[PDB]
Amino acid sequence: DFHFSAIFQPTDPHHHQTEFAKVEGSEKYVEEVEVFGRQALKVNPEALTILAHRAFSDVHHFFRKDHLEGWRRAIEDPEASDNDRYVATTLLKNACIAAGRVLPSCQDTGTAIVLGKRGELCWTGGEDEKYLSKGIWNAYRYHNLRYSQTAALDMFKECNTGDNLPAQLDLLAVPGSDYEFLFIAKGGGSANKAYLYQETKALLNPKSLRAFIEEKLKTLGTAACPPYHIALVIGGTSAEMTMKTVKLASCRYYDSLPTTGDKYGRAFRDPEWEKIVMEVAQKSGIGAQFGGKYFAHQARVIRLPRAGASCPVGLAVSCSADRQILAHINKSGIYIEQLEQNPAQYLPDTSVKVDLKRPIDKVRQQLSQYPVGTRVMLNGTLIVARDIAHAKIKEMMDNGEPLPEYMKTSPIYYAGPAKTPEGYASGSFGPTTAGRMDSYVDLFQSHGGSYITLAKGNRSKQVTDACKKHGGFYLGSIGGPAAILAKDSIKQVTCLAFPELGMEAVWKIEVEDFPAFIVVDDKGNDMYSKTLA
Amino acid sequence: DFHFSAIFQPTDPHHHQTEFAKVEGSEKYVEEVEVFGRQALKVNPEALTILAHRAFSDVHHFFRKDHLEGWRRAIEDPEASDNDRYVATTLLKNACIAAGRVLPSCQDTGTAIVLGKRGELCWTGGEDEKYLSKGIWNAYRYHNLRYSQTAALDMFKECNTGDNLPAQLDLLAVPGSDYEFLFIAKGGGSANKAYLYQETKALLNPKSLRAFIEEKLKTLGTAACPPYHIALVIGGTSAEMTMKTVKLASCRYYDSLPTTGDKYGRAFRDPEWEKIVMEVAQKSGIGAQFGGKYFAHQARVIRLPRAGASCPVGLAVSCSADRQILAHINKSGIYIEQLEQNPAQYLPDTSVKVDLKRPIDKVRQQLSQYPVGTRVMLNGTLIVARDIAHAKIKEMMDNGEPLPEYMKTSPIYYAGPAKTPEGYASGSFGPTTAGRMDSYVDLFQSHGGSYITLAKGNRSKQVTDACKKHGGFYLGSIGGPAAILAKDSIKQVTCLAFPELGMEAVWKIEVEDFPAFIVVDDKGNDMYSKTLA
Lengths: 533, 533
Ligand code: SF4
Ligand code: SF4
Description:
fumarate hydratase, lyase, binds iron/sulfur cluster, Leishmania major, alpha/beta, 14 helices, fumarase
């Protein structure tokens, strides 16, 4: 016989376990009507603008409960290292600064990703993408966020869009008369740690699957600001269907899934292997960015059906800028997920001063006296440059032009600033993944620059070779707390070169008491070699 | 100050360049009505069953023009190798056998993928997925197709579903009153060659991108039945958005895109780099499965916007079972893409006999006298076993049980048969990707079995090592032509062990004049080591 069985069978398909708050007066944009015997809902498209505006505004200032609980868990656990409690407190204190509705929680305000489920009898006019984008356009223009989207004029010529557009508008056709949503402010670092592996039947056994998890979790590293929300998907009907599942699973969108499969190949969570992923994360010693136990907040494992020959595997994380918001529109109005507004209640209840107001050769001498893992406090001037800045500088040296003088005077800060609020010295200004500028380290160091670099995440072995060769260093900043570094450490920000690039321009900043860890010294040591071998 | 710009702006968004055919009397399933001043369309949900039925039935017997043109181009091109013209003729002859509406073009009838775009005012009742699944359920139940889906009862315990369900129903919400579709019969092998790479700005330059394409195209190998439809996507708003684009790009779904970018980051095809991908494919010498020029039919390259920190890259192919069908439902009725029904017009106007009815050691002696690249014709008995059959045998040997004697008598054929037509000796019965059973070659050969293996695609270096140690061989069949091997070569099919596995049971077949190439000999030679180094 025939029996239809949906792949995803969530016992809470409308997310009732989430607390919502209705926008004041939002019932003027909806009207319940009846057509041909069926109840419909007439939605003013201006409601989609309001919803995307409020969603992509508040999500950069508040977090969910399960995200804040994980930070408190890293502080109150006796088994957490001193670095775990240090990073967890720095992020929680950063979460309190962001709650002021002025600074975003992280400088990477991220890509706007909208998963919309429009009912068959939910009528908006059809221009949902135009109206949702306008709400997103207001969120990033009129608030101290950052334009992070890069348009391609051809295959290689790029420019910023100036409005954090386009967005990923994944609008689906679902039954009913409502309009359910899921807004995601996916950061760049956590989006780059969405890995796709094509596997076989040989993987599907407890011995090989655990070894797979042990092997692949190390590839995440600390380049996406742990503690993570590790998501793992085994199987799938296609590569994109697996990567979409692991993306939503990282947002706890599929938590209501069953925990047992049937003869119809339904999706299900496997809590047994969720605990196994957490055991591998804790035993790894990678910890919260700088060694410890709390490498991950929690794990979600989903087992999907597969073809007899195919077995794709998805692995993705949610960074410390865990930014998702559930929402829906019905006859009552616009309801949007309520996020925790008082993060201070989750807060319970050894450093070395380094001044960069010297010749950089004198700063290099001081850093050489301390081993990897030493906590340092930078006080001086930094030169900020990232992906596009490094790419242009290399093209100058390939045309005979010299290495610019700003690359040699001060340490290099891999960072991209958000917009500065009125009356503030600097907007959110946190570090960026260092590993993306690894191919420029040896080249720039052999030309008398980039001796000291300040960023976030583990770097490749070629960088340690270049540092032990040219006598350089790599300082590892706490990745994540961009708001507290703006209101405390950074005192002055000035543009230096390439103002056409927006965030990715060359900046000169003056910092005070900037926390960082010595990750790579001039002797060939890497503080991540023990845990990320 | 605000301007909305969709990412994908195809100049032919309704696919007018495609030839459609109206189902007779299909206008009885639609009724055009007007509500609140806007014209809507009421669609009987039974129309989705009829549409999915005809789509997933006819697509397994006919191909598009550009796929058949690539085969003819591989025969008449002077620069095509003798093996290119041999494989291209074998596939063309297979398309004519499949055109008989009895045998499917390939034994892997694939996963049913449905991309539906339901209009805002297109009313079907909401149960679109239930009715679409029934149409797919009828296509694979009542036609000589194959149940290829594997349900997971838990994390490791698996069983077949018996109906090639579930499907991937990606139903989107689009403006209007129509219902546009794209049906895909995505095979397992080509779905496993959908690769995701997370890259950086360092890749975005002509020197690095060319080296990237050269390096990554070799990793595809021949395990997905070339000539390919190579699709490459640079950038994207997320990993799943990149992998979805490269799949649709492989189906020529985005051919109508512009060829230039703007300050708004719209998607566009880059024909310049499409020719560069074609130049890399032809100059690679990989050719149509066994060395030559036609490694790919054509290339599609799409440049997507990206975040300043993100740069995902998608690479996927469409195998020789290029199976996609466009369709839509409007006030006129049900329209479905017209595929070429007479493929013979595309066909323009010494082998080594090997007898397998001997001791397998005597067959090994004969094959040892010939080098790699020798084309052989198998005449005897083969033992058919695949992913789950190999997996169960290994767990038996891990419990102390011996390697079953049927693994030692005859060569092992990595294949999974489709359903047998009434009065036919065997349904479509082509080879599967060999590289997925590579971990069993050395183990099984040390127990006196699996000395000769017959499948498709290049294998890992551990297989070449195991052959020079245990004196084994690996014959590479022409991957793709499953229909012509059923009506000509295969004479009898009998189940031998593990009938619980359905398709993936252990089969004993008697073939006659089975074409194959000696890929790995007992001396450490690999005919793919030169092109896939
Ligand atoms: S810098 Fe860290 S917290 Fe911010 S978006 Fe990137 S990975 Fe997430
Ligand atoms: S066997 Fe070859 S042609 Fe058939 S589905 Fe697999 S890759 Fe495609």
